[PDB]
Amino acid sequence: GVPIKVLHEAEGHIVTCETNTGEVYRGKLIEAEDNMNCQMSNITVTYRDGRVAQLEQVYIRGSKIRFLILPDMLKNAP
Amino acid sequence: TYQRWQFTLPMMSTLYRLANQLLTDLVDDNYFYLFDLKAFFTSKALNMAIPGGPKFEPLVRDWNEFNDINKIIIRQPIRTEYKIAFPYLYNNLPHHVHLTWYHTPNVVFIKTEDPDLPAFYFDPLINPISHRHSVKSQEPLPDDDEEFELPEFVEPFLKDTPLYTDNTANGIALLWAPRPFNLRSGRTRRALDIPLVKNWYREHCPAGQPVKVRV
Amino acid sequence: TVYEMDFLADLMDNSELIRNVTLCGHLHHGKTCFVDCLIEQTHPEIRTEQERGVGIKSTPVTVVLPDTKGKSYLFNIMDTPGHVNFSDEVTAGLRISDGVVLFIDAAEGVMLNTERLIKHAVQERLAVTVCINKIDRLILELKLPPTDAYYKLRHIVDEVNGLISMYSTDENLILSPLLGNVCFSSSQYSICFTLGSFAKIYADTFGDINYQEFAKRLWGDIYFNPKTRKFTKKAPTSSSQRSFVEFILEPLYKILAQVVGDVDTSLPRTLDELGIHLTKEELKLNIRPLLRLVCKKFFGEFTGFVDMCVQHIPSPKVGAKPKIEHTYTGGVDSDLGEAMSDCDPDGPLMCHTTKMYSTDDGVQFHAFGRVLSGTIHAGQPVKVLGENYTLEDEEDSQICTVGRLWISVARYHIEVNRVPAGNWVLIEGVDQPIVKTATITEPRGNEEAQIFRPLKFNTTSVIKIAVEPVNPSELPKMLDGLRKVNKSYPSLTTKVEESGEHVILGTGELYLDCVMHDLRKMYSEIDIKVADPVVTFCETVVETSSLKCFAETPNKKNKITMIAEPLEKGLAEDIENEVVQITWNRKKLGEFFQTKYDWDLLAARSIWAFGPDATGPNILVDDTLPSEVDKALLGSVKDSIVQGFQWGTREGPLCDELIRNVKFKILDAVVAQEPLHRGGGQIIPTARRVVYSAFLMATPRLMEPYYFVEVQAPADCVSAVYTVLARRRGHVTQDAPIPGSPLYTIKAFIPAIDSFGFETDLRTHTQGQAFSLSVFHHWQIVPGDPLDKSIVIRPLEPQPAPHLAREFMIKTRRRKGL
Amino acid sequence: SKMLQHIDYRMRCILQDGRIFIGTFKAFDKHMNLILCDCDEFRVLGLVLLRGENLVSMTVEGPP
Amino acid sequence: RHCPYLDTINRSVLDFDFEKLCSISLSHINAYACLVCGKYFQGRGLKSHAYIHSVQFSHHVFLNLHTLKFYCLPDNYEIIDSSLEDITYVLKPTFTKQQIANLDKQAKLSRAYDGTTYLPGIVGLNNIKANDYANAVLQALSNVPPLRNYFLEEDNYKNIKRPPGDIMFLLVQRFGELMRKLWNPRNFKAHVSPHEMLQAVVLCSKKTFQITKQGDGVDFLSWFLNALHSALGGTKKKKKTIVTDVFQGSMRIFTKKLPHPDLPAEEKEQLLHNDEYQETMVESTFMYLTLDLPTAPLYKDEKEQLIIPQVPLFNILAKFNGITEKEYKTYKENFLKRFQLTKLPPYLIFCIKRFTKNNFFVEKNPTIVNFPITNVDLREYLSEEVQAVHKNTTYDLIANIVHDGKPSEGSYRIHVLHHGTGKWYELQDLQVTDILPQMITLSEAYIQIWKRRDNDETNQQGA
Amino acid sequence: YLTEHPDPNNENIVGYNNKKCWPRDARMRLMKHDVNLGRAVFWDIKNRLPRSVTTV
Ligand SMILES: Nc1nc2c(ncn2[C@@H]2O[C@H](COP(=O)(O)OP(=O)(O)OP(=O)(O)O)[C@@H](O)[C@H]2O)c(=O)[nH]1
Ligand SMILES: [Mg+2]
């Protein structure tokens, strides 16, 4: 499916993850679990106060992700 | 209209065996290493006769340096088989020449004289693996005898089916049969061609003959 | 094709999802068919080598295949011919590629070329992954029991691991099923699987159980208890087959057995359990085709190989750090080495040309290369650097604009606008400028980058063929043709002698024949005459000369006393392998030599040069009381003498061939003080004479190249093989049965000259059962003495062994030296 | 079923927070997870994937 | 600046007009001439036949055939400061516009190293007994002033690391060097060897110079003209410098400017009918104008000539007098014809049909072709001067291929005007001889070049 | 002779006459040194005769 194939297909590629509380995390995802929980490396987190927090590794939960920004060119589907 | 046959394998294997006497010995195609059309074109082109092959009318129609004997090292003397095999090295002025030379993984065909138990526990050759080294390749996989609970209701997919079946041997045998018997469904053919004598035609060096047969 | 092009461009741009892959496997172990099947999966658009049935040339294929995760991957695959003679293409492929995949036939077991390929990969520091092709042979040909099959499988992997351990002192990696390094695949029936891959399939069919943990305990000495549930170490006396057998080989056999064995009575129900859906039409196919279809549906796309490639391949990023030290002459330090390592499309960029791919229409051919750094745009003008070109040697170098770029699917040419570094690419318009291996650089840019070391060949070319066009007036056309083949083939070495005979050097018959054929039908129209095949020889001296001739120069400003004696048993071989090479410090090198061979410390100090090649068999040594007294001048004279000595060693004093395994030693050096230009100019010619004279004084040396031969044969024909070898002066080394397969392996050696037509004779006598591969391996002194006037040579009749040396010597001289 | 008629079409997705997503509907799942192409929030998100847990309403905002 | 080995140089053993190969490797790549034995060796580096040769054959000064540089070995350095300007010039002659005017020499009597004494452009060529035809075309084209001056001072063309504005390929670089060579006022010997050019034109497929069984001055002229126009061409320097004024087969294609102008003419044929049926006109561009030659018996034995036909030779004069077009429109093919020469080119090649290779070996058309025109007043001038006897344009003979009937092949000798001494000049296999221009016609004419004056009344007035 | 007739190809012998009547071992051997001498000698003699009087 689109969540699965593009989820694990984005491993190693830069992607943006927007949490439910408004925390945006942009970076290269290391892996995507079937539970939708993902782990990103060298991800930049921007809080609601405008504070940019650069983390070497971050693990985002599946239920805590509101949406995700996939890379421009890849084919899971047309 | 009696075109397009589909065969039960059992029928096919039975017929094959009855035609077994007519059938050639060897499943592989390596036997006919020298049985090459390209070779025959080249032989005619190079005007060279292969020991026990066909001869032919000649296709169309001097001290030199390389010829000289004192400068020649001979270990082995360039036999005509080499000239035909590599006619642009062996043979000068090749024209319209194709590349004979078929090299492939060795063809091994297994058959058993007595049915025994379907399948064979050990090969006829009986080559021994006799794995030999250190601690027989220690494997550090999933935590055995610990966290490897395993999954309930799961089993190998092919376990229910038997490894071999009463017709397994026959099925395998039909993989290496002369062309009309290797297909369950094969195209219907006329009797216009003539005979199945080509295997007989293919004989290389029978021996105990008058030339009569060589011709 | 445009959508695909966009996706390909994105993948190329990423440079981490694309890993260059090169696969080499013994003749007929299925590399070519595997690639063909992969291409079919990738592009359902199905639009000399073919007739021969043997790959003669390496072909590069680029494809995008989804893995188990589903992330798209970019793979550059270069297929290398299995045949040992055409190994050179494989070496080129290995140099271009990051990692090499090894293919081994299950039934055949370890084979000649497998070993050689593994050794080359270890030397070249490329990660090695091995796929076992023709897995079905045991099941459907050998009919080995599943336990038996597992035993045979364990053996091959163990042997491969042993070879890797032997080649590299450090055991960074070992190949095992648990690691995922080795993939069990059969190319023909479209089943490619690894324990991980099989585990994934099992998980998909079943509930959701964790695949990785099951895979780890899945293969190698693990027993699964049904009552126990989770896998555990074997504790059942009753005996349940190792879990590899229980979960993999058992069901694999059962699938195959049903389809071949029944196919009507019970085959459908088995399919239901499997869940495969079959058309009635499909079930009416012949067994091989039907079996392949069934297997394809059950095994998915071709996932194991892709998984292996993504997982254990360093790819573009790691790429250069291991690669550049061997490849780049600078080896990194200040700029270029660092830049190459990053691999970004910035600054110097860079290209490396390791191949020339011929065009049918014209002599010019498209070059193939792995873009090392930055990126290349169509119509840009790029500097070309020859292997000859170094630091400040502008005359060899030439610069030309790039007409077009192509990305190569199997024998299809995708035009593209630009190519990022780390991607294989065909370059139009660089054909005239480059000979053999080449380096492409920023054109007119200051940049300055050392050329990548030229290809170093696993074999040594030995077989010499003379060529002359039938009609003299067509000579220049033939010469043109020869140029083309020099570009087309890697090791193919040509030369023009003093006589004027045009000579081609090759690796063996098949190589030579194919080269001849290719030139004749594709490069030059002209009819070509050909001399009978002859081996080169090498010259060595059996014993030291009692008296050393000392020769003055044209102007008698100096004299040189030099002796010669054959080098030690384990000296020449080490010298060449660079074990005791001239690069090392005098203290380090001398000490090493003394320790290894009980070398004198003083003699070690006295070592000057290795003669003909930077790594060469010959040694130049200075041992005089006088030299120490006036060293200043002595160093300069020694350098000039060493150049002269180098010249002398390559040419020869008998057959005008290379001198092998000889130490030359200076005992008296006479140079007039303040010699100036006199010494500088006169000494070199003199030195050449000096070398020869000592060679004349220091015994007679007999040499001939020998081939290592592997013969695979049934038990009944071993006697015939032995007889052929005995007939041709061969001698057999080892005769041993092949484990897990029926057949004997015969290893033997055979003189190069006597090897002509050996293959063919062997096959003919054994009714096409025995098969021989042959590779240059070993030099060995010929029975006949180099000089024997009392020996009378009959003009046609083959001579007896006691004086072959004379025959060879004289005839070779008559061919050119006179 | 009805999911095949909306394939390769531009729909309008509403979330639980009141945000509207207008993009080309590509693929979905049994969990109602919409993958929109060239989506525009009411900032251009472009290619994005929205969860079905916070989904509210899915309407057709224009021809495919 | 005595690099003392300069003393060892043997000018008299150089010969650049040899195939550009190492004599002991037969590679073209990085070829160096030894200046002491004049033998080619592939080179620079240690194990190169040039380096080895420099030391086993004691010959240190070399010339890099493909790059304009000299090297002194054994060290392997370049001789920066090159009194070998003499040598380099015998490789690669170089000219500035002054030189082509300069002396009005027109062809001032040069010396070679042998002190043999020959008029610069007016040089013969070795091995006429296999390339005599080729030597005739090469001397025709290298006589035509716009063509010749183009090559002689277009030094830009095909270096290694040239700019972008310059290239055209190996065929044109070599024909350029042939032309340069044949005008060289300081040739080391009197005569030149185009045998390698010719063989490269058969062997180097980008020319399929692959004509045989005829292989004449006409055929080779055509094959050359066509080739040059394809191989220098528009924007790719080969149609701007060519000169699409200097002829103009004005009908079609304008190709390399110089030889679609500069060798084509246009005959507008004009088919007519009576009644009111306005039959049709066919302009055709043509680099060489095939004259017929009336009805020579050929399958008829002889004592020929004055006892079958010579004198009235001249069935021929300006034969057609308008070709098919003016008086004798005996135009057998159809209803009415006249064949006007409607463009009239700054040269005009004529080619006499001397014979029908369609049949046997050939009894030719020997009927002598009397235009030794003798007419200028100030005459005995061979005043050639052909004026159009319906219009005026006024043209002076300036070349004249002759056939000769050697019992072995053929032969093809070539007679060139020399405006400035006013002396016709035969060359005949490295031989040269002056010829009475009124007696030219007593050979079997084959090909003439006819310059346009009165266009030099446009350029007698246009200076 | 070489200066008078120098060819890169050195075809020379291509046309060089010999006797087909004798067996190969008896018939004249072909060598550049031999063949170039042959052509040089012939050439030298040919050049002593005016074409207008006679030729060879
Ligand atoms: N048993 C078995 N044989 C196979 C399979 N795939 C290919 N072969 C056979 O192995 C032989 C060699 O296969 P190829 O792929 O053509 O060999 P290649 O590697 O492409 O060409 P070379 O490199 O010259 O060996 C052929 O005779 C094939 O029929 C397979 O899956 N199983
Ligand atoms: Mg292959």
Domains and CATH numbers, chain A: 1-78 (2.30.30.100)
Distance from C-alpha of C507 to C-alpha of C88, rounded to nearest angstrom = 9
User: Per the CB < 8 Å rule, is A72 touching D46?
Assistant: yes
Spacing, Cα E291 to ligand 2 middle (Å): 63
Residue C388 structure tokens = 């000859």
Determine which residue's CA is closest to atom 20 belonging to ligand 1.
C32
Q: Is E415 marked as a binding-site residue?
A: no
E203–C435 CB contact, under 8 Å: no
Amino acid (1-letter code) at residue C570: G
Beta bridge partners of C64: C74
Task: Output the six-digit token pair for B24.
Answer: 């050639």
d(CA B53, CA B34): 10
Beta carbons within 10 angstroms of residue B35's beta carbon:
14
- Cα separation, C17 vs C9, in Å, equals 12
The residue among C393, C431, C467, C647 with the most chain E CBs within 10 A of its CB, best to mutate, is C647
On chain E, the residues whose CB falls within 8 A of the CB of C435 are 29
Q: Enumerate residues 410 to 469 of chain C having a beta carbon within 8 A of any beta carbon in chain B.
A: 465-466, 468
- Partners of D50 on chain A (C-beta within 8 Å) are 66-67
DSSP one-letter code for C227: T
Q: Which of residues 758-787 of C touch B (CB under 8 A)?
A: 758, 760-761, 763-764, 767-769, 771
Q: Which ligand is nearest to the CA of C35?
A: 1
Residue C140 DSSP code: I
Cα C426 to averaged position of ligand 1 atoms, centre (Å): 27
Question: How close does chain B come to C251, measured CA to CA in Å?
Answer: 4
> Smallest Cα–Cα separation from C662: which of C717, C611, C607, C709?
C611
Expressed in angstroms and rounded, the spacing between residue C114 Cα and the centre of ligand 2 is 15
CB C696 within 8 A of CB C549: yes
Query: Within 13 Å of residue C175, how many CA atoms lie on the same side as its CB?
Result: 30
Resolution of the structure in the document, Å? 5.7
Nearest to C496 among E25, E47, E56 (CB): E25
Where does ligand 1 bind, in terms of residues with CB under 6 Å? B 104-105; C 27-33, 54-55, 81-83, 133-134, 136-137, 186-189
Sign of the C-alpha dihedral, residues B165, B166, B168, B169?
positive
Cβ–Cβ < 8 Å for F1, F44: yes
- Torsion angle, alpha carbons of C429, C432, C438, C441, to 10: -50
Min Cα–Cα distance to chain B from F31, Å = 8
The C-alpha of C338 sits at a distance from chain A's nearest C-alpha, in angstroms, of: 23
- DSSP, residue by residue, B23-83: S-S-SSS-STTS--HHHHHHHHHHT---TTS-----S-----TTT-STT---SS---HHHH
Smallest-distance ligand from the CA of C34? 1
- Partners of B75 in the β-ladder: none
CB contact, 8 Å: E160 with chain C?
yes
DSSP letter assigned to residue E440: G
- Interface A:D, ≥3 CB–CB pairs < 8 Å: yes
**How far away, in angstroms, is C358 Cα from ligand 2 center?**
17
Q: Across the interface, do F9 and C500 touch by the CB < 8 Å criterion?
A: no
**Residue of chain C whose Cα is closest to the Cα of A78:** C3
What are the tokens at C337?
A: 């080495």
E144 φψ region: left (φ > 0), alpha (ψ -120 to 50), beta (else): beta
Give the residue, out of C111, C139, C187, C741, with the most ligand 1 atoms within 8 A of its beta carbon, to mutate for a pocket test.
C187
Output the CA torsion sign for B194, B199, B204, B209. negative
Residue E94 one-letter amino acid: T
Q: Note the helical H segments in E216-340.
A: 217-231
Determine the residue type at E298: L
Q: Report residues near ion ligand 2: CB below 5 Å.
A: C 32, 55
Q: Which of E343, C749, C762, E340 shows the shortest CA–CA distance to B33? A: C762
Residues within 8 A of A (CB atoms), C 326-355 only: none
Nearest to C7 among A12, A13, A75 (CB): A75
Strand E61-64 versus strand E69-72 pairing type: antiparallel
B105 CA distance to ligand 1 middle (Å) = 6
Q: Which helix (H) or strand (E) holds E351?
A: strand E347-352
Protein residue whose Cα sits closest to atom 12 of ligand 1: C28
Please report which ligand is nearest the Cα atom of B103. 1
- CA distances for A44 relative to A22, A50, A52, A72, E444, angstroms: 14, 12, 7, 20, 94
What distance in angstroms lies between residue C54's CA and the mean position of ligand 1's atoms? 10
Phi then psi dihedrals of residue E201, to 5 deg? -80, -20
The pick from C29, C32, C33 for probing ligand 1's pocket by mutation, whose C-beta has the most ligand atoms within 8 angstroms, reads C33
The reply, when asked if residue C28 is annotated as ligand binding, is yes
- Rounded Cα–Cα distance for residues F11 and F31 (Å): 11
Kindly state the tokens that stand for E303: 């004592």
Cα C33 to middle of ligand 1, angstroms: 6
Residue C520: its H or E element:
helix C509-522
Going from the C-alpha of C630 to that of each of B155, C559, C637, the distances in angstroms are: 87, 15, 11
Start-to-end CA span in chain A (Å) = 12
Q: Among all ligands shown, which has an atom nearest to the Cα of C32?
A: 1
Considering CB atoms only, which of A2, A63, A78 is closest to D49? A2
Question: Using CA atoms, how far apart are residues C313 and C75, in angstroms rounded to an integer?
Answer: 11
Kindly state whether C495 is in contact with chain E, defined as any CB-CB distance less than 8 angstroms: yes
Burial of C523 (0-12, 13-18, 19+ CB in 10 A): buried
Name the residue of chain B whose CA is nearest to F13's CA.
Answer: B64
Does C260 reach chain B within 8 Å, measured CB to CB? Answer: yes
Contacts of C472 in chain F (CB under 8 A): 9-11, 13-14
| C-beta separation of E158 from E92 below 8 A | no
CA separation (Å) from E371 to C609, E294, E318, E442, E443?
A: 80, 15, 8, 10, 11
| 3-state SS, residue C324 | helix
- The verdict on E165 touching C (C-beta cutoff 8 Å) is no
Do C25 and C31 contact (CB within 8 A), yes or no? yes
Nearest to E32 by CA among E67, E5, E7: E67
Residue C186 Cα to ligand 2 middle (Å): 15
- F with C: 3 or more CB pairs under 8 Å? yes
C-alpha–C-alpha distance, residues C534 and A21, integer Å: 82
How many whole angstroms separate alpha carbon C660 and alpha carbon C571? 11
- Positive or negative, the CA dihedral E356, E359, E360, E364 is negative
> Nearest ligand, CA of residue C256?
1
- DSSP character for E209? -
Distance from the D56 Cα atom to the nearest Cα atom in chain A, whole angstroms:
14
For E364, the token pair is 């030719």
> Which DSSP state fits C451?
P
How many beta carbons lie within 10 A of that of residue E210, not counting itself?
10
Spatial CA neighbour of D27 closest among D3, D55, D62: D3
Whether the CB-CB separation of C206 and B128 falls below 8 Å is answered with: no
Residue C513 at interface with chain B, using a CB cutoff of 8 Å: yes
Q: How far apart are CA C801 and CA C789, in angstroms?
A: 16
Cα A48-A52-A57 angle, rounded to 5 deg: 110
Q: Of B93, B136, B143, which has the smallest distance from its Cβ to C470's Cβ?
A: B93
Give B146-208 as a DSSP string: TT----TT---TTSSS-SS-TTHHHHHHGGGS-GGGS-SEE----S-S--STHHHHT-----S
E97: left (phi over 0), alpha (psi -120 to 50) or beta: alpha
Which of A17-35 are b and which e, b meaning 16 or more Cβ less than 10 Å from the residue's Cβ? bbeeeebbbbbebeebeee
> Residue C496 and residue E52: Cβ atoms within 8 Å?
no
Closest CA to B74 of C184, C796, C509: C796
The pick from C32, C56, C135 for probing ligand 1's pocket by mutation, whose C-beta has the most ligand atoms within 8 angstroms, reads C32
Q: Which of B8, B74, B140 sits opposite C178 (nearest CB)?
A: B140
* Residue C391, strand partner residues: none
Q: What is the DSSP letter of C452?
A: B
**E vs D contact (3+ beta-carbon pairs below 8 A):** no
Spatial separation of the C-alpha atoms in residues C721 and C704, rounded to whole Å: 23
Phi first, then psi: give them for residue C371, nearest 5 degrees. -65, 120
What's the token pair of residue B28?
């592989």
Query: Between D26, D46, D53, which is nearest A2 by CB?
Result: D26
Token pair 């031969």 in the structure block, residue: C709
What residue owns the CA closest to ligand 1's atom 26?
B104
Nearest to C398 by CA among C366, C362, C429: C429
